[PDB]
Design a protein around this motif. Structure first.
Motif, PDB file in Angstrom:
ATOM      1  N   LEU A   1       0.796  -1.203   0.008  1.00 28.94           N
ATOM      2  CA  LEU A   1      -0.028  -0.073  -0.139  1.00 28.94           C
ATOM      3  C   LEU A   1       0.944   1.342  -0.110  1.00 28.94           C
ATOM      4  N   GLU A   2       0.849   2.051  -0.967  1.00 30.49           N
ATOM      5  CA  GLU A   2       1.725   3.212  -1.118  1.00 30.49           C
ATOM      6  C   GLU A   2       1.197   4.345  -0.139  1.00 30.49           C
ATOM      7  N   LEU A   3       2.243   4.719   0.604  1.00 29.22           N
ATOM      8  CA  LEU A   3       2.108   5.982   1.801  1.00 29.22           C
ATOM      9  C   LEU A   3       2.754   7.317   1.592  1.00 29.22           C
ATOM     10  N   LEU A   4       1.925   8.338   1.728  1.00 30.28           N
ATOM     11  CA  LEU A   4       2.614   9.848   1.884  1.00 30.28           C
ATOM     12  C   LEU A   4       2.411  10.125   3.238  1.00 30.28           C
ATOM     13  N   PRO A   5       3.279  11.142   3.734  1.00 27.36           N
ATOM     14  CA  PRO A   5       3.068  11.449   5.164  1.00 27.36           C
ATOM     15  C   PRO A   5       1.643  12.113   5.173  1.00 27.36           C
ATOM     16  N   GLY A   6       0.963  11.868   6.207  1.00 30.78           N
ATOM     17  CA  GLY A   6      -0.482  12.693   6.572  1.00 30.78           C
ATOM     18  C   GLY A   6      -1.536  11.678   6.165  1.00 30.78           C
ATOM     19  N   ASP A   7      -1.367  10.635   5.258  1.00 30.03           N
ATOM     20  CA  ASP A   7      -2.282   9.792   5.054  1.00 30.03           C
ATOM     21  C   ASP A   7      -2.779   9.109   6.224  1.00 30.03           C
ATOM     22  N   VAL A   8      -4.218   9.132   6.489  1.00 26.64           N
ATOM     23  CA  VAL A   8      -4.702   8.287   7.481  1.00 26.64           C
ATOM     24  C   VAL A   8      -5.118   7.009   7.116  1.00 26.64           C
ATOM     25  N   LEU A   9      -4.430   5.946   7.711  1.00 22.30           N
ATOM     26  CA  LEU A   9      -5.065   4.551   7.416  1.00 22.30           C
ATOM     27  C   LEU A   9      -5.943   3.933   8.409  1.00 22.30           C
ATOM     28  N   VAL A  10      -6.831   3.208   8.049  1.00 19.18           N
ATOM     29  CA  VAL A  10      -7.616   2.455   8.923  1.00 19.18           C
ATOM     30  C   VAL A  10      -7.219   0.870   8.893  1.00 19.18           C
ATOM     31  N   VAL A  11      -7.128   0.273   9.997  1.00 20.77           N
ATOM     32  CA  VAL A  11      -6.823  -1.169  10.170  1.00 20.77           C
ATOM     33  C   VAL A  11      -8.098  -1.740  10.989  1.00 20.77           C
ATOM     34  N   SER A  12      -8.414  -2.969  10.581  1.00 18.65           N
ATOM     35  CA  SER A  12      -9.479  -3.522  11.323  1.00 18.65           C
ATOM     36  C   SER A  12      -8.949  -4.496  12.520  1.00 18.65           C
ATOM     37  N   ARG A  13     -10.071  -4.549  13.572  1.00 26.09           N
ATOM     38  CA  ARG A  13      -9.394  -5.201  14.634  1.00 26.09           C
ATOM     39  C   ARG A  13      -9.206  -6.832  14.204  1.00 26.09           C
ATOM     40  N   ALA A  14     -10.046  -7.344  13.070  1.00 26.63           N
ATOM     41  CA  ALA A  14     -10.231  -8.711  12.729  1.00 26.63           C
ATOM     42  C   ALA A  14      -8.822  -8.830  12.040  1.00 26.63           C
ATOM     43  N   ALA A  15      -8.398  -8.127  11.364  1.00 29.05           N
ATOM     44  CA  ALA A  15      -7.081  -7.997  10.656  1.00 29.05           C
ATOM     45  C   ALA A  15      -6.032  -8.376  11.613  1.00 29.05           C
ATOM     46  N   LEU A  16      -5.740  -7.330  12.651  1.00 23.25           N
ATOM     47  CA  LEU A  16      -4.731  -7.468  13.588  1.00 23.25           C
ATOM     48  C   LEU A  16      -4.929  -8.876  14.507  1.00 23.25           C
ATOM     49  N   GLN A  17      -6.140  -9.262  14.966  1.00 20.49           N
ATOM     50  CA  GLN A  17      -6.322 -10.448  15.679  1.00 20.49           C
ATOM     51  C   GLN A  17      -5.572 -11.659  14.529  1.00 20.49           C
ATOM     52  N   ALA A  18      -5.891 -11.562  13.246  1.00 24.68           N
ATOM     53  CA  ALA A  18      -5.714 -12.607  12.579  1.00 24.68           C
ATOM     54  C   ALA A  18      -3.886 -12.745  12.284  1.00 24.68           C
ATOM     55  N   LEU A  19      -3.364 -11.849  12.539  1.00 24.04           N
ATOM     56  CA  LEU A  19      -1.973 -11.733  12.489  1.00 24.04           C
ATOM     57  C   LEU A  19      -1.326 -12.211  13.751  1.00 24.04           C
ATOM     58  N   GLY A  20      -2.165 -12.296  14.989  1.00 27.33           N
ATOM     59  CA  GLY A  20      -1.739 -12.776  16.209  1.00 27.33           C
ATOM     60  C   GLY A  20      -1.261 -11.571  17.031  1.00 27.33           C
ATOM     61  N   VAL A  21      -1.629 -10.410  16.526  1.00 28.84           N
ATOM     62  CA  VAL A  21      -1.406  -9.103  17.524  1.00 28.84           C
ATOM     63  C   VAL A  21      -2.201  -9.395  18.692  1.00 28.84           C
TER      64      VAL A  21
END
Ligand code: CL
Length: 82
Positions: A21-41
């Motif tokens: 995913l391309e980023l530039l400074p100031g970009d707001v990213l949304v990450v879902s809780r389901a996705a972190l759980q799925a990575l084992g965070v």
């Protein structure tokens, strides 16, 4: 609890892989809780993106989804999703 988390990019990221995913400074990213759980965070590790490593997410400026490095972003807090 919250369905997602917001981050803000602090540093530009150029895609390396098809799924990046391309980023530039100031970009707001949304990450879902389901996705972190799925990575084992573990619960509350979302507050240390430098430790999560790579995360899948929606970039709100571009509207794209894909993987980005947590060490390039700061945690902003919890959110509602679309
Ligand atoms: Cl590429």
């Amino acid at each position: 609890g919250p369905e997602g988390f917001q981050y803000r990019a602090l540093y530009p990221f150029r895609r390396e892989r098809p799924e990046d995913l391309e980023l530039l400074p100031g970009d707001v990213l949304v990450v879902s809780r389901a996705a972190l759980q799925a990575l084992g965070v573990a619960e509350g590790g979302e507050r240390c993106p430098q430790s999560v490593g790579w995360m899948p997410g929606l970039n709100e400026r571009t509207r794209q989804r894909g993987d980005f490095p947590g060490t390039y972003v700061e945690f902003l807090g919890p959110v509602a999703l679309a």
